[PDB]
Amino acid sequence: MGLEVMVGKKKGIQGHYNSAYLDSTLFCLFSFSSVLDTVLLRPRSKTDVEYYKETQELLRTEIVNPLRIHGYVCATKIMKLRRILEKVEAASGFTSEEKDPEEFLNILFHHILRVDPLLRLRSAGQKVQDCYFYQIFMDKKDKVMVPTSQQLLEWSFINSDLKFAEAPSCLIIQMPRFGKDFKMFNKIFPSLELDITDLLDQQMELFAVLCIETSHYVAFVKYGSADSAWLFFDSMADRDGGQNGFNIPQVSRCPEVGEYLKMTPEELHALDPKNIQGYARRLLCDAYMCMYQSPTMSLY
Amino acid sequence: MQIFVKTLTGKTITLEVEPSDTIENVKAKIQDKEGIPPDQQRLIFAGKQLEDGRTLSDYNIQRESTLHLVLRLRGG
Amino acid sequence: MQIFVKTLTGKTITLEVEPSDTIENVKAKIQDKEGIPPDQQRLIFAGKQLEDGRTLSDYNIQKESTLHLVLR
Numbered sequence: 001m002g003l004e005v006m007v008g009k010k011k012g013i014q015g016h017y018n019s020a021y022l023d024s025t026l027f028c029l030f031s032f033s034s035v036l037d038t039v040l041l042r043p044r045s046k047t048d049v050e051y052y053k054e055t056q057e058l059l060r061t062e063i064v065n066p067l068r069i070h071g072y073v074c075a076t077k078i079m080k081l082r083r084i085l086e087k088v089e090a091a092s093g094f095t096s097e098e099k100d101p102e103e104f105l106n107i108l109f110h111h112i113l114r115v116d117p118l119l120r121l122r123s124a125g126q127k128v129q130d131c132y133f134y135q136i137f138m139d140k141k142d143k144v145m146v147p148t149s150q151q152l153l154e155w156s157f158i159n160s161d162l163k164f165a166e167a168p169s170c171l172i173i174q175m176p177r178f179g180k181d182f183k184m185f186n187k188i189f190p191s192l193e194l195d196i197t198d199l200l201d202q203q204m205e206l207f208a209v210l211c212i213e214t215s216h217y218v219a220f221v222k223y224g225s226a227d228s229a230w231l232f233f234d235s236m237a238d239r240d241g242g243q244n245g246f247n248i249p250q251v252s253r254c255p256e257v258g259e260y261l262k263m264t265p266e267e268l269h270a271l272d273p274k275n276i277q278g279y280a281r282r283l284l285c286d287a288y289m290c291m292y293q294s295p296t297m298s299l300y
Numbered sequence: 301m302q303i304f305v306k307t308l309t310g311k312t313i314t315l316e317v318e319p320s321d322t323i324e325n326v327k328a329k330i331q332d333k334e335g336i337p338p339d340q341q342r343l344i345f346a347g348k349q350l351e352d353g354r355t356l357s358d359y360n361i362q363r364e365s366t367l368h369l370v371l372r373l374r375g376g
Numbered sequence: 377m378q379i380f381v382k383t384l385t386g387k388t389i390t391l392e393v394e395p396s397d398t399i400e401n402v403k404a405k406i407q408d409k410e411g412i413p414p415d416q417q418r419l420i421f422a423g424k425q426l427e428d429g430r431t432l433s434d435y436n437i438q439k440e441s442t443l444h445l446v447l448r
Contacts, residue, residue, distance in 0.1 A: 018376030018439065020378075098374035102342075123346040131349060135342075137368045139310065160368075162347045178308040179340065179371035213392050216378040217375045238388045239380045242442055243422075288373060376439070 003223065005071040006031070007231065012249040013067070015235030016075035018098045020217035023078060023235035023249070025101040028208035028291055030064045031233075032223040035170040035207075035293040039113050040064060048114065051084055055112050058084075075247070088112065101210065101217070101289065102174070105132060118172070120165035122201075128165050133172035133289070140184055146265040149173060149191040149206070149290050157199050164200040171204055171292040180214045186273075187284045189265045194292050205298050210289040211282050220257065220283050225297035227262065228255035232279040254279045301363040305330060305343075308370065319357035323350045330369065344368040377439035379432075381406065381419075384446065395433035399426045406445065418448040 006012075012031070013023035029036050040060040044053050062077045085094040085104065088111045094104070109115040109132055117130030136156040143155070153173060157163065171194070176184035194204040209220045219233040230253070237250035256278040260268065273281050305313045315329055327338035343350040345359050345367050361367070381389045391405055403414035419426040421435050421443050437443070 015376070016440075020376045021374070022376075098376045100372040100374055103372070121347050126346070129346060129348040131347075134347070135344065135349075135368075135370060137308065137344065137370070141310075160347055176308055177371075177373065179373065182309060184308060212373055212375050215375045215394070216392050234390075236378055236440060237390065239440070239442055245442065247440065 001069060005069070006223075007071070007251050007253060009238065009250045010248055011071045011251040012233045013063075013073045013078060013235050014075045014249045015247050016078070018096065019075065019078055019082075020235050021099045021101050022082070022104050024210060024217040024219040024233065025104060026063065026078075027067075027219050027233050027235075028210055028221060028289075031067055032221055033207045033293060034296075039109075039115055042113070049088075049112055051087060052112055055081070055084055055108075071251070072249075084112070098215075102133065118170050119168050121162050122165050123160060123162045133174060135174040136176045138176060138184075144265060145269045146185060146187040146189055148189040148265065149292075150194060152176065152188070153194070154199070162199075164196060167196070167200060167294070168204075169294050173290045173292070175287050175289070177288065183285075187265075187268055188287050189268065190261070190283070190287060190290050192261055193295075193298065203295055203298075204292040205295040206290060207293050207297070208291045209283055209287055210291070211286040212288045213282065213286045217288075218282065220254070220279070222297065225299055227258035228253075229297075230254050230257040232257075232282075252279070256280045257283055260284065303361065303364060304366045305369050306366060308368075313369075317356065319361070320355055322353065322355050324352045326356070327352075336371065340371045340374075342370040342372060344370065379437065379439060380442045381445050382442060384444075389445075393432065395437070396431055398429065398431050400428045402432070403428075412447070416447045418446045420444040420446065 013027055015023040040056055058077065058080055063073055067073050082094045085107055086092055088107055118132045119134060120128050120130055122128050136152045138155045138159055175188060190206055190209055192206050195202065196204060207222045211218050211220065221231045221233065223229045223231055232252050232254050235249040236247040238248040239245050240248065257280045260280050268284065273285055276284065303315050303317060305315060313333055317326060323343060324338060327341045330336065330341060331338055345361055350359060377393060377395065379391055379393060381391060389409055393402060399419060400414060403417045406412065406417060407414055421437055426435060
């Protein structure tokens, strides 16, 4: 087992038929990280749903395993998962329709592998609230051109008075985006590490970013503590066959991402997207979800 | 009884509603003022995503409360 | 809705586009990736040459469709 396996064309989750909101998400959470592995392992309780075992089997052994071991997953297997998804919510259109990772994640986590909420948050010192991801919300004008996940998060935590009940193991943040037609910022500096000490009654590390310019999902993954340790994933990077055909996923190294995350925000603001080498453009411009975990890769 | 809904853009929109109303009933009203399918709408109160089945009284929303509105990002 | 554009050489190029977009809007994107004036570009779908005025929805192009590109 290793990394050389994971990289290249015909690697990662092969998408098919509006799958990217799923291929890319699954790739973020599982390809390299292990925050959520427990989910795949908790054995079957009485209390869980009828489908629970099957879901967990497909996920672990037909998806996550062969991802990590061979570096590839046929779309065949994704469609299965989709099917199950629909068995909860008939008229969801998980099998065909374009979806939001939030949608897909909620269904899966809450409804099938009922997973203890990843977050606990106390607004106004009032009752707690649980969820699986936080959406940044705030007011822009008085701010910078390119902020960081840190600032966003902080700023978002303020303006609706909130705080973490307890340290999360795994923190998924959605960028400030009003649909296809509205980014709040052209560029966002994803904080490599995240200090939440101020935001509970210490430290968290960035392990993947999920991107989308307007309508297609692709993913970046931190596989190492190293600056260069980044990969880019596109489930439908290429095709063979006509209308009758099949997609080919690809996974590519992109150290550049690292290099740019050593530059500053005011420095990246000055930069034109057409001058941002390699795949970095999409990370800095098309961030949808940033994903943090309690540190493992980090040294020191 | 009257509450505020804010988009990310900054725009506020006001609604005459009853504590009894459901979040679907509410997105119906939002849609009419802003032409956005409830499919896409994602309402938030106190940092919490609101389910379509529940009512406002249930999320302890009072008159003059402020909700945030956010869209989905369907892709694939 | 992401789609593929193939040159004769074999090279694939991918595009993030909307059904609403026009073929000019698209050749604009192609040009940027491959440095070819839309003057010269000739797009084809289902064996059919695509007019600059029409949109993708109109030619019944779905996501993950494959267009051919050729110079004129």
